[PDB]
Every structure is written in structure tokens, then in C-alpha cells.
């Protein structure tokens, strides 16, 4: 049963390198042909490179031709790509995928190989950006007086993610934690809202709680309605 | 080289899908189909046209004529919700090529409105000299909105994001637009405004700097 395991997915400035590697087993590296796609988050499919048994056939796209590097270890069923010259285009989700390798041979046209994906592994993180780690910055959002809607704007914080609980967790009921936008600053920002008992204003108290544990920061505000 | 394919697509439970693929003398080449749920690996359904993998139910079937292709399922069910990629190998450019991607919606629950809830920017972001609007659009079903901002009765778009639609804790949809002021922006306003598009419906909230 076929396996593939990317890694080393990170974070990196415009200008800069990362090497994305891949593990396999389940069937017979040595004689299979192996390919990168990757995926901006959102949107499609986007093909990188192949890469066959001895590396005697190799291609690449367009894209990344020049500033990437297809290579192979067979002896550790290892598949390797080298992304130099990074640019925030390459932002994406990077997946590696066997191929089943079907082939064709016919004397005087040569071999004729017709290429498809017949695996796939996981995927693997990449972001390229200008940005470094910074904490995010925790505002209320207060409700204004059926019920009513309250909430926290997490602003201004890179990497991803963060996560948003309310009451230490015990609040699930109503929640909704949005997706986070990026905005021109190259930082990220999302809202999280609860709907809650309009009349349960004044008596039960709301306080969220935001974590991003790459800045290793933790955030608790309680939000209270305004005053007018 | 190039394939297009319909960025959308929806049909009722238990009917018929149509998914196509477009590209030029496209019938000369083999044309396989991925199948993509969010958060996920892609997977083989259709490969050499029409052919199809063990493993993946009968209701998969392949077509490839002249200038389009076609996956087609049948007896769609909730589960047949995903992204759906045609590929090719272009011999010529050597290039593997994958179409846009169709997302299939099956309509398998009730349309919903959205309801619409609009925060100023709270006191503390401004005494950062911050000013900003959330606009939080929850509930709604089928899962496509469209947001405009208003400024007292006249649009602007300098300034605004705002999210793709994402499911919920109910499988309705959510999204969220922020709309960044300067400090002074936003009190030299009589009020702004958030207006979404749901389905032909429109519905619309209102803040003024002035008050709550």
C-alpha cells in the first residue's frame, strides 16, 4: 500500500532556498517515475516537475524552470526538490506523487511514455514571505444593544495559524472562528464571533482566548459590551 | 497548452453530473480525472479516458470526443462533494497539464439567507490610530456571497478583503470582510456601509462613527 511522506515545508524570505523531501514505500521506487505538484492554497493543481527511475528522463514547468531542482536517492526511496530563488508565487502547497509508469515501445518511433498520478502523499507547507514571526494584537469586538453577536479581531500576526477559543473552552456553542485574510502588510488577521443570549449580557461574561504558537504567544481578553 | 474547465458546478441528490474539459484536439490525448476533498490527497477516478480504477464505484464513467471530455457521475450523493481535475501530458511541451479544478456542490440542504452583522472599529484599535470594519456574514447556504462597501452613498474598493465562504459547525456557510480606515477616514463620514448579495437578494448594515 502506497506511502509518501513530505517534509521540510517552512517559511522564507523572497530571494531564498528550501529543500522539500519526500519518503516512500509501499511499492518499488527503483522503478517508478516520481512528480511534485503543488497547490496555492485555494486555488488548483499546479504541476512542477517529473522525474523518472534513473533520472534519465527530467522536466520541468515553465514557472520554475531554472530556479528549481528535481534529484532522487534510490537506495533511501527519497525524492528531493530544491527551490532556489524563491518568489511569493511559490507560496503553495507542495505535494509529491508517484506515477504508474505506463510505457510504450515501437522500433523505429522510439519509447512513448504517458504520464498520470497513481499516488500521493499528504503535502507539505511553503510559504515565501517578507514577513517574520510576530504575535498578534487582540481587539474586542463589542456587541451593540433575540440575541446578539460579540467577537475579537486577532490583527497584524505571521506565521499561521492561530486559534481562538471562548471561556478557556467551555463556550462552543454559537462559535464561529473565520479564515484568516492577508493583507498588503504581508501580516494576517481574523475575527472570531459568538452568538449568545441577548439578555445574558450584564450577568455571564465572555472572554476569548487567541493562541499562535509560532511567536509563542497566548492572548486573553474578555469583551464587554460598550458604554456610550 | 491549455485546459478549461467550468469553475462550478451542482445538482440535486441521486441526479446526474456533468463535469467537462476543454481543450484543443483534446480527443488525440489521454485525459484522466482527480478527485480532490478539502484538505486532502487527490485521487484517480477515470484514467485513459474512460477507464476506470478498482475501487471507485461504477457511477464513474469517462467520455473524450473532438474538443471535450467528460467525467460524468451518476446517482450523485452528500459524499461526491469535492474538487474534480482533468490532466493531459502535453508531448510537445513536455509539460503535465491540469485543468482549473470544478468544485461539485451537491444541494443537499435548504437554502438559507445570510444574516449579516457589522462591528466598528472598537475604541482601543483607534487609540492605535487603527480604524477598522468587520463584516461578519454567517448562516447562508448555498456557500457564494458578494460583498460592496459603501461610503455614506458612494462604493469604494480601496482597502477592503475579504474571505472565500467556508462551512460551519452546520454545514452552512460563513465569510467574513474587513474594510481598513485611517482614524480620520472614518469619523470626516456621516456612517458606512456593508451590502451582501446572496442568490438576487440583498441585504445591508450600517454604521455611523457617531454612536454605537
Known amino acids: 500500500e502506497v506511502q509518501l511522506v513530505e517534509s521540510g515545508g517552512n517559511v522564507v524570505q523572497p530571494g531564498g532556498s528550501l529543500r522539500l523531501s519526500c519518503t516512500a514505500s509501499?511499492?518499488?521506487?527503483?522503478?517508478?517515475?516520481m512528480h511534485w505538484v503543488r497547490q496555492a492554497p485555494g486555488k488548483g493543481l499546479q504541476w512542477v516537475s517529473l522525474?523518472?527511475?534513473?533520472?534519465?528522463?527530467?522536466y520541468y514547468a515553465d514557472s520554475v524552470k531554472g530556479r528549481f531542482t528535481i534529484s532522487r536517492d534510490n537506495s533511501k526511496n527519497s525524492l528531493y526538490l530544491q527551490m532556489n530563488s524563491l518568489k511569493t508565487e511559490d507560496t503553495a502547497f507542495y505535494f509529491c506523487?508517484?506515477?504508474?509508469?505506463?510505457?510504450?515501445?515501437?522500433?523505429?518511433?522510439?519509447?512513448?511514455?504517458?504520464?498520470?498520478?497513481?499516488?500521493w502523499g499528504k503535502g507539505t507547507t511553503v510559504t515565501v514571505s517578507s514577513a517574520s514571526t510576530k504575535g498578534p494584537s487582540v481587539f474586542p469586538l463589542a456587541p451593540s444593544s433575540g440575541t446578539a453577536a460579540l467577537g475579537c479581531l486577532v490583527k497584524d500576526y505571521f506565521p499561521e495559524p492561530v486559534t481562538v477559543s471562548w471561556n478557556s473552552g467551555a463556550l462552543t456553542s454559537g462559535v464561529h472562528t473565520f479564515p484568516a485574510v492577508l493583507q498588503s502588510s504581508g501580516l494576517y488577521s481574523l475575527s472570531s464571533v459568538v452568538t449568545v443570549p441577548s439578555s445574558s449580557l450584564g450577568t455571564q461574561t465572555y472572554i476569548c482566548n487567541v493562541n499562535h504558537k509560532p511567536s509563542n504567544t497566548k492572548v486573553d481578553k474578555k469583551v464587554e459590551p460598550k458604554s456610550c | 497548452y491549455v485546459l478549461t474547465q467550468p469553475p462550478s458546478v451542482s445538482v440535486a441528490p441521486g441526479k446526474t453530473a456533468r463535469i467537462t474539459c476543454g481543450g484543443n484536439?483534446?480527443?488525440?490525448?489521454?485525459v484522466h480525472w482527480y478527485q480532490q476533498k478539502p484538505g486532502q490527497a487527490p485521487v484517480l477516478v477515470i484514467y485513459?479516458?474512460?477507464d476506470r480504477p478498482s475501487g471507485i464505484p461504477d457511477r464513474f464513467s469517462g467520455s473524450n470526443s473532438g474538443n471535450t471530455a467528460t467525467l460524468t457521475i451518476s446517482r450523485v450523493e452528500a459524499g461526491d462533494e469535492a474538487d474534480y481535475y482533468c490532466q493531459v501530458w502535453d508531448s510537445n511541451s513536455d509539460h503535465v497539464v491540469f485543468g482549473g479544478g470544478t468544485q461539485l456542490t451537491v444541494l443537499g440542504q435548504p437554502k438559507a439567507a445570510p444574516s449579516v452583522t457589522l462591528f466598528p472599529p472598537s475604541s482601543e484599535e483607534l487609540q492605535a490610530n487603527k480604524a477598522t470594519l468587520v463584516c461578519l456574514i454567517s448562516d447562508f447556504y448555498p456557500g457564494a456571497v458578494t460583498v460592496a462597501w459603501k461610503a455614506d452613498g458612494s462604493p469604494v474598493k480601496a482597502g477592503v478583503e475579504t474571505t472565500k465562504p467556508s462551512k460551519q459547525s452546520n454545514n452552512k456557510y460563513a465569510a467574513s470582510s474587513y474594510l481598513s480606515l485611517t482614524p480620520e477616514q472614518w469619523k470626516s463620514h456621516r456612517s458606512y456601509s456593508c451590502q451582501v448579495t446572496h442568490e438576487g437578494s440583498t441585504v445591508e448594515k450600517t454604521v455611523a462613527p457617531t454612536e454605537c
Open positions: 484536439n483534446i480527443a488525440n490525448k489521454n
Open positions: 509501499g511499492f518499488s521506487f527503483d522503478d517508478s517515475t
Open positions: 506523487a508517484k506515477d504508474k509508469g505506463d510505457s510504450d515501445y515501437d522500433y523505429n518511433l522510439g519509447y512513448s511514455y504517458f504520464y498520470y498520478m497513481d499516488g
Open positions: 522525474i523518472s527511475w534513473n533520472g534519465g528522463r527530467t
Open positions: 485513459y479516458d474512460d
